Each structure stands twice: as C-alpha cells, then as structure tokens.
Amino acid sequence: IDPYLEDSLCHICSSQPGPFFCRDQVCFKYFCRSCWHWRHSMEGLRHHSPLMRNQKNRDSS
Ligand SMILES: [Zn+2]
Ligand SMILES: [Zn+2]
C-alpha cells in the first residue's frame, strides 16, 4: 500500500509535509528544516545528507 500525509508528515514537529528524509539508521524518518536541525543539532550526525521528495518540472511553457 502507498503512504499518506497522515504517516509521512514530520515525526517530530508534524507541522510540515516532511519535504526531506534522512537515510541513516539513527534517523530513518521524514523531516523538515526544523526537525532536521533537531536530529542533526550535534556534531555527531553532521555527516548525514537530506534526500529530496519533490522536484521541478522539465518544462515551464
Ligand atoms: Zn540523520
Ligand atoms: Zn518537521
């Protein structure tokens, strides 16, 4: 079954669509700029990189 916005929202702030995701086993959840900085506030996880969830169209006509 496909996911929903009621389960793929931010899991810490639930105030944004969770536009990013963290691939490490200590995050493994969706985040926004706010809750991303809450799981990466310390220097120990600064090696993580956010995955995208949306992109621009290949046309602008
Ligand atoms: Zn992370
Ligand atoms: Zn968030």
Side-chain angles (χ1 to χ4, degrees):
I1 191 173
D2 58 288
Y4 299 103
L5 185 57
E6 299 183 273
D7 185 63
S8 62
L9 202 64
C10 289
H11 297 134
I12 315 295
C13 64
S14 48
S15 293
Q16 292 291 353
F20 303 113
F21 182 88
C22 192
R23 187 57 177 182
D24 292 78
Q25 303 294 349
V26 303
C27 303
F28 197 65
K29 286 180 181 296
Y30 289 101
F31 300 104
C32 62
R33 185 54 56 218
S34 293
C35 50
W36 177 274
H37 286 336
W38 296 344
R39 284 290 185 95
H40 307 114
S41 182
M42 55 182 169
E43 188 174 89
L45 301 185
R46 298 295 183 81
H47 62 286
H48 297 183
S49 298
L51 280 64
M52 300 180 66
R53 187 175 177 168
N54 191 15
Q55 295 182 358
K56 185 178 179 295
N57 191 12
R58 299 182 180 181
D59 180 37
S60 305
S61 302

mmCIF file of all heavy atoms in Angstrom, residues 2 6-7 15-17 19 24 32-34 36-37 45 47-48 51 54 56:
data_model
loop_
_atom_site.group_PDB
_atom_site.id
_atom_site.type_symbol
_atom_site.label_atom_id
_atom_site.label_comp_id
_atom_site.label_asym_id
_atom_site.label_seq_id
_atom_site.Cartn_x
_atom_site.Cartn_y
_atom_site.Cartn_z
ATOM 1 N N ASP A 2 0.384 2.332 -0.624
ATOM 2 C CA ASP A 2 1.101 3.592 -0.703
ATOM 3 C C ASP A 2 0.935 4.400 0.589
ATOM 4 O O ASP A 2 -0.081 4.264 1.271
ATOM 5 C CB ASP A 2 0.624 4.375 -1.930
ATOM 6 C CG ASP A 2 -0.884 4.646 -1.886
ATOM 7 O OD1 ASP A 2 -1.654 3.680 -2.085
ATOM 8 O OD2 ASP A 2 -1.248 5.819 -1.658
ATOM 9 N N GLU A 6 -0.741 11.482 6.499
ATOM 10 C CA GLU A 6 -1.039 11.270 7.912
ATOM 11 C C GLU A 6 -0.011 10.338 8.568
ATOM 12 O O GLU A 6 -0.112 10.054 9.759
ATOM 13 C CB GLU A 6 -2.462 10.716 8.067
ATOM 14 C CG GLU A 6 -3.490 11.705 7.516
ATOM 15 C CD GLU A 6 -4.913 11.193 7.732
ATOM 16 O OE1 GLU A 6 -5.399 10.447 6.853
ATOM 17 O OE2 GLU A 6 -5.500 11.554 8.778
ATOM 18 N N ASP A 7 0.974 9.863 7.799
ATOM 19 C CA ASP A 7 2.003 8.962 8.304
ATOM 20 C C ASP A 7 3.391 9.341 7.779
ATOM 21 O O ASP A 7 4.397 8.830 8.269
ATOM 22 C CB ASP A 7 1.632 7.529 7.910
ATOM 23 C CG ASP A 7 2.591 6.502 8.510
ATOM 24 O OD1 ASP A 7 2.645 6.416 9.758
ATOM 25 O OD2 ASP A 7 3.270 5.813 7.714
ATOM 26 N N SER A 15 4.402 19.688 11.549
ATOM 27 C CA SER A 15 3.907 20.981 11.109
ATOM 28 C C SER A 15 4.286 21.268 9.659
ATOM 29 O O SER A 15 3.887 22.296 9.112
ATOM 30 C CB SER A 15 4.474 22.060 12.027
ATOM 31 O OG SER A 15 3.943 21.919 13.326
ATOM 32 N N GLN A 16 5.050 20.365 9.040
ATOM 33 C CA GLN A 16 5.437 20.468 7.643
ATOM 34 C C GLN A 16 5.254 19.116 6.964
ATOM 35 O O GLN A 16 5.235 18.088 7.642
ATOM 36 C CB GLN A 16 6.893 20.922 7.540
ATOM 37 C CG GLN A 16 7.093 22.367 8.008
ATOM 38 C CD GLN A 16 6.460 23.392 7.066
ATOM 39 O OE1 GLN A 16 5.967 23.059 5.994
ATOM 40 N NE2 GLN A 16 6.473 24.658 7.466
ATOM 41 N N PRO A 17 5.121 19.102 5.632
ATOM 42 C CA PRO A 17 4.878 17.908 4.835
ATOM 43 C C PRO A 17 5.985 16.857 4.915
ATOM 44 O O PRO A 17 5.851 15.801 4.302
ATOM 45 C CB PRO A 17 4.746 18.406 3.396
ATOM 46 C CG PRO A 17 4.370 19.879 3.537
ATOM 47 C CD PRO A 17 5.138 20.284 4.789
ATOM 48 N N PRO A 19 9.369 17.362 3.814
ATOM 49 C CA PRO A 19 9.913 17.526 2.470
ATOM 50 C C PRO A 19 11.288 16.874 2.317
ATOM 51 O O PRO A 19 11.803 16.793 1.204
ATOM 52 C CB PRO A 19 10.003 19.041 2.274
ATOM 53 C CG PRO A 19 10.278 19.544 3.688
ATOM 54 C CD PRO A 19 9.408 18.620 4.536
ATOM 55 N N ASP A 24 20.187 7.567 7.279
ATOM 56 C CA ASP A 24 20.959 6.890 8.307
ATOM 57 C C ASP A 24 20.048 6.134 9.266
ATOM 58 O O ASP A 24 18.883 6.483 9.441
ATOM 59 C CB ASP A 24 21.836 7.907 9.030
ATOM 60 C CG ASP A 24 22.926 8.441 8.100
ATOM 61 O OD1 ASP A 24 22.605 9.315 7.263
ATOM 62 O OD2 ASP A 24 24.076 7.962 8.238
ATOM 63 N N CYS A 32 11.577 18.135 8.181
ATOM 64 C CA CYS A 32 11.551 19.447 7.565
ATOM 65 C C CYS A 32 12.774 20.205 8.073
ATOM 66 O O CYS A 32 13.563 19.648 8.835
ATOM 67 C CB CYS A 32 10.240 20.152 7.908
ATOM 68 S SG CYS A 32 10.105 20.383 9.700
ATOM 69 N N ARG A 33 12.956 21.465 7.672
ATOM 70 C CA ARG A 33 14.142 22.208 8.074
ATOM 71 C C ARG A 33 14.237 22.313 9.598
ATOM 72 O O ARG A 33 15.337 22.399 10.142
ATOM 73 C CB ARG A 33 14.107 23.585 7.404
ATOM 74 C CG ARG A 33 15.379 24.398 7.668
ATOM 75 C CD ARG A 33 16.643 23.634 7.272
ATOM 76 N NE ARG A 33 16.599 23.206 5.868
ATOM 77 C CZ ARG A 33 17.058 22.032 5.422
ATOM 78 N NH1 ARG A 33 17.598 21.150 6.259
ATOM 79 N NH2 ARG A 33 16.977 21.734 4.129
ATOM 80 N N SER A 34 13.095 22.304 10.296
ATOM 81 C CA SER A 34 13.056 22.442 11.742
ATOM 82 C C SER A 34 13.472 21.149 12.441
ATOM 83 O O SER A 34 14.408 21.152 13.241
ATOM 84 C CB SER A 34 11.647 22.835 12.180
ATOM 85 O OG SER A 34 11.347 24.132 11.707
ATOM 86 N N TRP A 36 14.786 18.527 11.100
ATOM 87 C CA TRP A 36 16.074 18.069 10.612
ATOM 88 C C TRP A 36 17.172 18.645 11.496
ATOM 89 O O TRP A 36 18.109 17.936 11.858
ATOM 90 C CB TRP A 36 16.289 18.519 9.165
ATOM 91 C CG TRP A 36 17.626 18.142 8.613
ATOM 92 C CD1 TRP A 36 18.765 18.857 8.743
ATOM 93 C CD2 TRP A 36 17.994 16.955 7.850
ATOM 94 N NE1 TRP A 36 19.809 18.191 8.137
ATOM 95 C CE2 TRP A 36 19.391 16.997 7.584
ATOM 96 C CE3 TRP A 36 17.286 15.832 7.381
ATOM 97 C CZ2 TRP A 36 20.063 15.962 6.922
ATOM 98 C CZ3 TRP A 36 17.945 14.801 6.697
ATOM 99 C CH2 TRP A 36 19.327 14.855 6.479
ATOM 100 N N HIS A 37 17.067 19.929 11.856
ATOM 101 C CA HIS A 37 18.064 20.542 12.721
ATOM 102 C C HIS A 37 17.963 19.997 14.140
ATOM 103 O O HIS A 37 18.907 20.152 14.912
ATOM 104 C CB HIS A 37 17.891 22.064 12.716
ATOM 105 C CG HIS A 37 18.363 22.726 11.448
ATOM 106 N ND1 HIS A 37 19.315 22.211 10.562
ATOM 107 C CD2 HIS A 37 17.932 23.936 10.989
ATOM 108 C CE1 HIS A 37 19.442 23.135 9.594
ATOM 109 N NE2 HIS A 37 18.627 24.181 9.826
ATOM 110 N N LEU A 45 26.246 13.829 13.989
ATOM 111 C CA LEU A 45 25.441 13.394 12.847
ATOM 112 C C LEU A 45 25.505 14.379 11.678
ATOM 113 O O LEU A 45 24.638 14.356 10.806
ATOM 114 C CB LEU A 45 23.984 13.146 13.264
ATOM 115 C CG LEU A 45 23.808 12.093 14.363
ATOM 116 C CD1 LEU A 45 22.318 11.864 14.599
ATOM 117 C CD2 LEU A 45 24.431 10.746 14.000
ATOM 118 N N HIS A 47 27.312 14.282 9.249
ATOM 119 C CA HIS A 47 27.698 13.555 8.052
ATOM 120 C C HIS A 47 26.475 13.093 7.257
ATOM 121 O O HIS A 47 26.624 12.529 6.175
ATOM 122 C CB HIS A 47 28.578 12.368 8.451
ATOM 123 C CG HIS A 47 27.856 11.376 9.330
ATOM 124 N ND1 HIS A 47 27.543 11.566 10.681
ATOM 125 C CD2 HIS A 47 27.403 10.153 8.933
ATOM 126 C CE1 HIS A 47 26.908 10.445 11.058
ATOM 127 N NE2 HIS A 47 26.817 9.577 10.035
ATOM 128 N N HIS A 48 25.265 13.329 7.781
ATOM 129 C CA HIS A 48 24.037 12.974 7.091
ATOM 130 C C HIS A 48 23.758 13.965 5.965
ATOM 131 O O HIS A 48 24.249 15.096 5.988
ATOM 132 C CB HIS A 48 22.863 12.971 8.078
ATOM 133 C CG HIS A 48 22.968 11.951 9.186
ATOM 134 N ND1 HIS A 48 21.996 11.726 10.168
ATOM 135 C CD2 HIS A 48 24.022 11.114 9.402
ATOM 136 C CE1 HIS A 48 22.515 10.779 10.965
ATOM 137 N NE2 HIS A 48 23.716 10.380 10.520
ATOM 138 N N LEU A 51 17.525 13.661 1.681
ATOM 139 C CA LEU A 51 17.014 13.161 0.414
ATOM 140 C C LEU A 51 15.822 14.022 0.014
ATOM 141 O O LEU A 51 15.117 14.547 0.877
ATOM 142 C CB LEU A 51 16.618 11.688 0.534
ATOM 143 C CG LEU A 51 17.811 10.726 0.452
ATOM 144 C CD1 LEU A 51 18.788 10.906 1.610
ATOM 145 C CD2 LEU A 51 17.301 9.285 0.492
ATOM 146 N N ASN A 54 10.447 16.120 -3.741
ATOM 147 C CA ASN A 54 9.792 16.803 -4.846
ATOM 148 C C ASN A 54 10.847 17.474 -5.726
ATOM 149 O O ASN A 54 11.931 17.811 -5.249
ATOM 150 C CB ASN A 54 8.807 17.833 -4.281
ATOM 151 C CG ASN A 54 7.883 18.407 -5.347
ATOM 152 O OD1 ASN A 54 7.772 17.871 -6.445
ATOM 153 N ND2 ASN A 54 7.207 19.505 -5.026
ATOM 154 N N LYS A 56 11.385 20.036 -9.658
ATOM 155 C CA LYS A 56 10.789 20.931 -10.641
ATOM 156 C C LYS A 56 10.458 20.165 -11.922
ATOM 157 O O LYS A 56 11.115 19.178 -12.246
ATOM 158 C CB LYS A 56 11.747 22.098 -10.903
ATOM 159 C CG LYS A 56 11.116 23.137 -11.834
ATOM 160 C CD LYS A 56 12.074 24.310 -12.040
ATOM 161 C CE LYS A 56 11.466 25.334 -12.995
ATOM 162 N NZ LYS A 56 11.285 24.768 -14.345
#
